[PDB]
Every structure is written in C-alpha cells, then in structure tokens.
C-alpha cells in the first residue's frame, strides 16, 4: 500500500507523537507488558531517582506513572544499557527471586539470549519465463 520499502513492510505505524509540543509518557500501560513474560510474576516499583531535573521533567497533575519531557528531547532510558546499567548490580533494575535471593547477570550473557534481528532486503517480484515453444 505505502511507498516502496526495500527493507521490510510496515503495515501498522507506531503512531509517533508530534514534536511541536512537549510529550507525556504514560507508563501505567507498561505493567502488563512487563507482566507478560514467563518468569515475571509481578513488579514492585516504578519510579525515577531524581534524574529528570536536568531538563525539568514535571510529573503531570496527580498520577505517579506519567512524565512530560520538555520540548526537544526524547527518552534514552538506559544509555549504553547493559554494561552501564543492567549488569553492574547498582540496581536500576532489581530482580527478586525466591523471596530474597536477588540474583544478577553480566553484560554478555543476556545478549546471547537476546533476540537478534535480521536485516532483510525485498527483491522485485517477477513472473519467470516458461518453456519457449516453436509455434512459429
């Protein structure tokens, strides 16, 4: 339907918000996307540790989950993600397993279990020839 896409087809759009105004990010929808996975039974916390003040991200009127990033910026939630944040056991993400045992992981171990995407190229569609017959 759309324009010619050499890589993949995009039948559904991600519905990107406009960048004329500042943008709220509502995370109350996140929990069931987080509750989905097999080993996860629930989540215990959802907050930010005072790293929003550099661009004055204000939480909107009453709800704890939403935050509004100021005009130009876009979220980068964990920059240089596993080695900087997730593996180091500083706790940006604290896993609690069997009451309290609270196990952790390194950087390279989760990349093997990470889904690796595939670069796909879309060749043009043609009808190949049949056998030429001497009707002449």
């Amino acid at each position: 339907e759309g324009p010619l896409l050499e890589h993949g087809w995009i039948p559904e759009l991600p519905a990107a918000r406009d960048y004329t105004q500042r943008l709220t990010l509502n995370l109350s929808r996140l929990v069931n996307s987080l509750l989905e996975i097999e080993g996860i039974k629930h989540v215990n916390r959802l907050r930010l540790d005072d790293s929003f003040d550099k661009t004055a991200i204000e939480p909107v009127k009453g709800d704890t989950w939403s935050w509004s990033i100021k005009e130009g910026y876009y979220p980068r939630l964990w920059g240089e993600d596993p080695l900087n944040q997730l593996a180091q056991q500083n706790g940006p993400l604290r896993v609690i397993a069997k009451g309290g045992i609270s196990v952790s992981v390194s950087k390279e171990q989760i990349q093997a279990s990470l889904p690796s995407q595939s670069l796909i190229q879309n060749e043009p569609v043609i009808l190949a020839y049949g056998q030429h017959r001497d009707v002449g």
Partner: peptide
C-alpha cells in the same frame, strides 16, 4: 499486590489508562 491490582485494571477491554 499494588501493581498486580493495577495490571488487573488494565486488562479490561474498555480501559485505556488509569491515573492513580
């Protein structure tokens, strides 16, 4: 649970988003 309550509200077909 506070969050398993909050997720159970989200799986209704008519809900969109809760505040608090």
């Amino acid at each position: 649970n506070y969050f398993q309550l909050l997720a159970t509200i989200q799986q209704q077909p008519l809900v969109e988003r809760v505040t608090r």
